[PDB]
Amino acid sequence: SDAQKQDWGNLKRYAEANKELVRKGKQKDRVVFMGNSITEGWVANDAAFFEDNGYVGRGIGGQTSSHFLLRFREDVIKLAPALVVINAGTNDIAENAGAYNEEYTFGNIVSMVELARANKIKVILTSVLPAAAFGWNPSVKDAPQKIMQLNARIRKYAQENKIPYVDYYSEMVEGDNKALNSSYTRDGVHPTLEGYKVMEALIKKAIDKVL
């Protein structure tokens, strides 16, 4: 039935891939990247960055921090990684799962951190990327303010818990309208390869400090 097919969290997306990874056995210094289309697109645009370094992408387009929390056990914990990199909030602010509530989104990140720590997985937290607006939801007129406010909460939580915070945002924002840098996005939200190369330099340096 259609009802039986429901899979709100999209656990199906990586179910087979996870089984294949698990079959290979424990791997040293595995890093899983949790996120939405920015993380999914990262693997799509620069697979070598992941493959060269033993990183595993678990991004799914359109998803919010609520979806990530639901997938966290299967798509992170069960892969027995050394470290998880969390990029969450863009689609929350874009209202993909309903009205944005910062407290709920921030709480989902904290929950993921707690689940990682309960399973001896190290965490890196990251800034939500700049966006002046979201192409698919122009009704959101205060994306910049929301992004900054959430990022400040994530950064403070990271400091309070001795978790690295990787600030993609400050390197990629441009203008008084707080756009994603015009030179490496087409749509204002998703990086092009040039943008991903900026992110790679930051995240690899932080990963290497932790591993």
Q: Which residues in this chain contact a second copy in the complex, by CB under 8 A?
A: 1, 3-9, 11, 66, 69-70, 72-74, 95, 97-99, 101, 104, 107-108, 110-111, 114-115, 117-119, 139
| Residue 122, binding choice from a second copy, Cl ion, none, Cβ under 5 to 8 Å by partner class | Cl ion
Nearest-approach distance from CB 15 to a second copy, in angstroms = 9
Residue 59 and residue 42 in contact, taking contact as beta carbons nearer than 8 Å: yes
Nearest-approach distance from CB 192 to a second copy, in angstroms = 28
Q: Degrees (nearest 5) of the Cα angle 19, 9, 40?
A: 70
Q: Where are the beta strands (DSSP E) in the chain?
A: 31-35, 55-59, 83-86, 122-126, 165-166, 173-174, 179-180
Pairing mode, strands 179-180 and 173-174 = antiparallel
Interface of this chain with Cl ion, residues 112 to 141, rule: CB under 5 A = 122-123
Our finding on whether 86 is near Cl ion (CB under 5 A) is no
Q: Which is nearer to Cl ion, 70 or 82 (CB)?
A: 82
The number of residues making up the chain comes to 211
Site residues for Cl ion per CB under 5 A = 122-123
